Symmetry: D2
Subunit: 462 residues, 4 copies
């Protein structure tokens, strides 16, 4: 009965066909492959297992490849031992990768570190554990003053709040991973650390060069530059992933919530899927129940209007994966049921009216003859109470629509005319079990128009 869709990162604990089947029962809609870890063999087997489960059970799911992305990391230390940095001390980064670190200096992986930073900038190390202020940049060195005590381990992430970083759109490993995703025909690519329009285009060109022109690109917004260029990025993307955890290190902490609300709102208006991700039910890596706060955070993202919510470690490596999917579905069901429609160009006019009509006739189902995703998403924009049954002849579209809120996709052989759509949609509506004899359904399609124009709405009794 839930409308919000659930993305599950699959890992060792959940990769078996047995587990995947149980995950789908519990509410999983989309499989996420986190390419920060694993090799092509492991990920290939996971894709294989899901498609076996789908083939045998007739259930639908989508597959999402989440790239590792480019990053700035610190490097190694003397004796591999942590060093204890003291507030007020001088500390230096070097772009020289050959340097082994200690309490006074460590190397970073990114050659451009000296270029992109400025005296006065803040360097955060290890998810903001240690904060430092740059006091001088000299040759290949960024000299800083440590702001807080902390322990520096080896290989830790670095964040540069408010700095535009000249890392490439794709790491070299990323480029290979994307070829793999095309080879495997994944449905979505979630691109890490997206900062500007040109990153999305570079990814679009790379997928297109390997037969991936139909793979939808979900841009992960992670830093202030991403936020600044959000509209540009949304325009070029097929969707957005809101990386709350990263944003919590990169922008003022009181802003993260409104960045999440802003981005979701704009994706709905733009008719593009949005996924709310990171720091959802993390405590369930270890515990069989989430915290009150985690429950409240998930629900408010649903109320904000996200299409989907995402599980990370709690479904890949955690001790209670099935519990975490199940309680997620419960939060989804509980929250979805109290949401109302938002009624506030030909396509917007017809779809908005179609929903308004569905509500005024207490119609449980809106049947959409979707060319691509556009038409089903144009109905979903107004948050219908009714479920969207989206008829498509395109198998990739069927998979991709799994991610949109309240959309039930249906693969069909063909629809040759508008009246055939009405005849066929009424049958498939009854067959779906989503509606019954005597219910009203509203039927949406294009007629005598190019694909991706919706110009027709029709009311039928089953």
């Amino acid at each position: 009965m839930k409308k919000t869709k659930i993305v599950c990162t699959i890992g060792p604990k959940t990769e078996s066909e047995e587990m995947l089947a149980k995950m789908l029962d519990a509410g999983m809609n989309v499989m996420r492959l986190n390419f920060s870890h694993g090799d092509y063999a492991e990920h290939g087997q996971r894709i294989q297992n899901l498609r076996n489960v789908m083939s045998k059970t007739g259930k639908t799911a989508a597959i999402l490849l989440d790239t590792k992305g480019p990053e700035i990391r610190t490097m190694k230390l003397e004796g591999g031992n942590d060093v204890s940095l003291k507030a007020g001390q001088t500390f230096t980064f070097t772009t020289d990768k050959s340097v082994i670190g200690n309490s006074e200096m460590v190397a970073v992986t990114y050659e451009g570190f000296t270029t992109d930073l400025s005296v006065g900038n803040t360097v955060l190390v290890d998810d903001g554990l240690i904060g430092m202020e740059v006091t001088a940049i000299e040759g290949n060195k960024v000299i800083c003053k440590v702001l807080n005590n902390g322990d520096l381990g080896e290989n830790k992430g670095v964040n540069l709040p408010g700095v535009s970083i000249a890392l490439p759109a794709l790491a070299e490993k990323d480029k290979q991973d994307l070829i793999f995703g095309c080879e495997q025909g994944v449905d979505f690519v979630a691109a890490s650390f997206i900062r500007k329009r040109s990153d999305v285009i570079e990814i679009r060109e790379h997928l297109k060069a390997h037969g991936g022109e139909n793979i939808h690109i979900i841009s992960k917004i992670e830093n202030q530059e991403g936020l600044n260029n959000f509209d540009e990025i949304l325009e070029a993307s097929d969707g957005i992933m809101v990386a709350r955890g990263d944003l919590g290190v990169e922008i003022p902490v009181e802003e993260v919530i409104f960045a999440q609300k802003m981005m979701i709102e704009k994706c709905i208006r733009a008719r593009k899927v949005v996924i709310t991700a990171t720091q959802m039910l993390d405590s369930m890596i270890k515990n069989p129940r989430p915290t009150r706060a985690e429950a409240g955070d998930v629900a408010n993202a649903i109320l904000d209007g996200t299409d989907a919510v995402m599980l990370s470690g709690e479904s890949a490596k955690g001790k209670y994966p099935l519990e975490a999917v199940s309680i997620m579905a419960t939060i989804c069901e509980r929250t979805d049921r109290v949401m109302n429609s938002r009624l506030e160009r030909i396509t917007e006019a017809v779809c908005r009216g179609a929903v308004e009509t569905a509500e005024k006739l207490d119609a449980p189902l809106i049947v959409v003859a979707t060319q691509g995703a556009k038409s089903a998403r144009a109905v979903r924009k107004y948050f219908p109470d009714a479920t969207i049954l989206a008829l498509t002849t395109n198998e990739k579209t069927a998979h991709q629509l799994v991610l949109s809120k309240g959309v039930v996709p249906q693969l069909v052989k063909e629809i040759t005319s508008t009246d055939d759509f009405y005849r066929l949609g009424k049958e498939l509506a009854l067959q779906s079990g989503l509606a019954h004899k005597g219910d009203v359904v509203v039927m949406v399609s294009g007629a005598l128009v190019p694909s991706g124009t919706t110009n027709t709405a029709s009311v039928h009794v089953l």
Copy 2:
């Protein structure tokens, strides 16, 4: 182009093919035949002339037969001389037709005069010129005391305010006139003096017995009983003619305006055509310009929301028929221009939305695939800015639709599917000159439903 339709009574000055053609140019939509006068040869000729003009010019118009109706009239007087009745005097009516009248007593045409009146009732003679109060009823005599001074001529109408009168629905001449109308295939019958549901029913059974089952019945509301039973009468009728002059004699004068507003409103809700008639431009029997008051009365009837307005003597016998049609058309245009749409069943929902959609996309035209008149009338109910182009395969339906406001009917060979309707309706929309390349049109129809269900709305660019 005006939206309000003009009914013109045709008489000796306007019956030629030459005049009818010029009447149509001036704005006439419907020819009214007043069967109070003329014989079958004269009326048949008028019907023939119009149909010739229609064939030669390709213009569409409907034909309306208006019955004389049953009436109560006074009788003859000694020496055929007017007599002066004095307020307070005794005066008696007799049902004995043989009696010649004088200052003390006159005969009436209706035997039921004694039965239907009651001591205390008011008797009005000659359009309320002389008013009388019944003081006794005895045998075949109704004794009254005169209320006001006035002069009593021969053969004058009698009105009995607030009295239920037991005249038959149809006079004997009416029954013959109606068969003539069936033989001649008129589009409308306007039945005079309708008082209750059963009157409408008796007329329908008379028509259905002579092949007139497709002739629409317009009930003329003329008295208090008619007003009391208006809902019943509307339900049974195809439309209503508001006879303001008659109502001014039967009900209190300050009520006539609201009785016209009430009746017009309810006809629109019911999707049934309404004509505002009587005392429109009567001064133009004699003069080439109407009165300020006359222009204002007509305009407020259009503003009340009438489908059509009617010319009587001013187009049948008057000295300036074309002047009267023309200035009527001018008022219709001037008043139609400032009217707005009125936005609040599957049919109701779809049609209301189609109009809302038209306005929101600035569509000049709503194209309706009408099964009978219901569907075009269902769109017209919301007073669209857009003109209604009504496709129908039935020639009688096409004629009848001429009387509905803002409706242009179009006879078509057939439409075999919904996509066929769109293809054809776009062609016909361009051909009509009513819309042009690049305009938006909204196309309304039924799909996989019984006739007289409207369940589909579709938006197209020409």
Copy 3:
């Protein structure tokens, strides 16, 4: 109790104290003195009689002086005999007053006749009975070609549609009549034939020179120029009288209705009283009942939203004055009953809210502490269901408020504070019989602000 106010022209049949008292009972609110007729003794007596009736009965009423105005009239004819002008013939007007007229030429009263006309202009004689087109202007002659057959009598009015006429704002007799009005302390002056701002100004400077600075000026809009400059005229005037009969001769007939609606709307927005006048119940000069049309015309004027309606000959000379007032009152009540409030400056905000508050609490009465008329008119603008009880310390203001719709004025000694107003207004509200123990009243006033600012609204239970 009706809300719309009735202006009655008083003449020989209605001037006695006996009749005036009965006129007030029947619904008269304002006495109109038509200075086209009567001398100062007669009018002074009418003023005296009313004021006697007012003192004896404690009823309130206002007095309105209506000027004759400047006019253009034709002159004398040979043997004083009508002449028959034939369409197409040449006919000449001369500014030479000494000329006696005939079939070919007549004199007019206005020398400026040559100046203001132009070849091509239309000249109308005798309320548009005969229409003429100027073909040449030469010396003191305006040569025309007659457009329609008609009979030309002596001393008939001339109208020049669409022409700007350079008559003075006031005739010489008018100037004397206005001083008389100042001496007599009338409440209103209705200025005839107002055409532009400067006419209103010249009348105000004439009044202010004779102690009339507090006499409200009602501008009579009678022709096209007046309509063109309406905003200017409204700005300068205290109110507007709509002279429908005159406008029917000056502008195209289908426009008169909308000119009445436009003018009434703008008066309401401007918080300035409007009177709908001319051609109301004229048939009741002769008959004891009006026409259906007459009743409908009056009612639509109230529905348009007029403050007041006016009786002319029917109450001055007619055979049935009390009948005409009574049936007018009946129409006012019947029409006022079905009208709703019209909810959309500090004053605007407070007054609009006070009405909204009244309706939401079902308050029968809004009590206004009015500095001059502005504040009561500011409440009246929204057409409250509640009656307006207007407290004022100024006796002239009290009289003038009689003309505003739904306003009951009340003369008070004083109100020294806001809490005093509430105490007193609750007492007076009960005393008025307009509200009762337990009713809610809304009390509107200014507090710590210049007069004519309304900034305070207060709700009390009686």
Copy 4:
């Protein structure tokens, strides 16, 4: 600039006058004394220090006593050593307080434990660390089956989801604490573990018996019974504290968020303060910045519409109290500024209109002449953009209004009339610095009515 008010639990780190002054600068509005800990001397000194800081700085703050409340705790264990409970094992509670516990059995503090529980009920121990299901109740023993592994320490809290517990409204210690609060003249008492109407009444009677009739009671809703009787409890209380942490152990976890939204909504409608408390910025006990999640949780409570937010350990015992207040204020400011008004009995009519008027005139300030808190809260209900300046002669009311959102209280000597209110409020509005010359203010009060009726709204320019 923030409107949301901040409650700070004061403890050893923050009790000095130096700290309290810095806490107020940072945004503290209300001091919370947590009587779970501390003795009357410590709490008395804290009240003394704040009142010194208030006296010296002229700043306002309120004092809130939060009772410890009645509780169910486990007791002691053999050798004071934790015992390791295994899922599936039998475990028994005994009401015998003399029993020292072990791995098989422990004593509880509440005699009624056997009575109130039923076979099948769930017993949670130590904030839900260990869950057990009751399998038998026998004499003074509740025998259970352990559901999950866990370690049992000494003296841990017990929760009984969905059980109605017959603990008293007040512990014996609570009753003494309340006398202390009266002695000290605290402004608020926050009563722990409120379950039904009768608890609020018992507290009301106890305060009244010690001169505390003016102390506002904030009911802490902590369990399912509290939720079930919420309306009853709200009715008897002056406000509500939402104890999210407790609710997270007592009710289904997906419900806690909607219980928080429900309760806040109802308190706003009821015109009673609501405080959102527990699990706000807990990580700041140890860290100088909150988490993204904690930031998001606080902001969503503000968006829900809470009057105030509360700091617990992070301001009493934590290492970074001033940081935690400051970042709280920042979240408040950032969130308050993007909230809109909610415009949707005489008092509701006038106040709702007063806010609507304030918005339509872009008024920065609504000045309220408040008798008690009622009137200022009746304005706050509609979430005005404008700040509420609440004039009161009552010093306790002034303190209590500190807790209401967007209310600036102002103690005044007296107001003798309505015009004095306007004169005085305009001065105090300018003096406050909240508005400036030329701004509009809306002024709200009662006039000629019993206290706690608001019937007057007035608009003034400064």
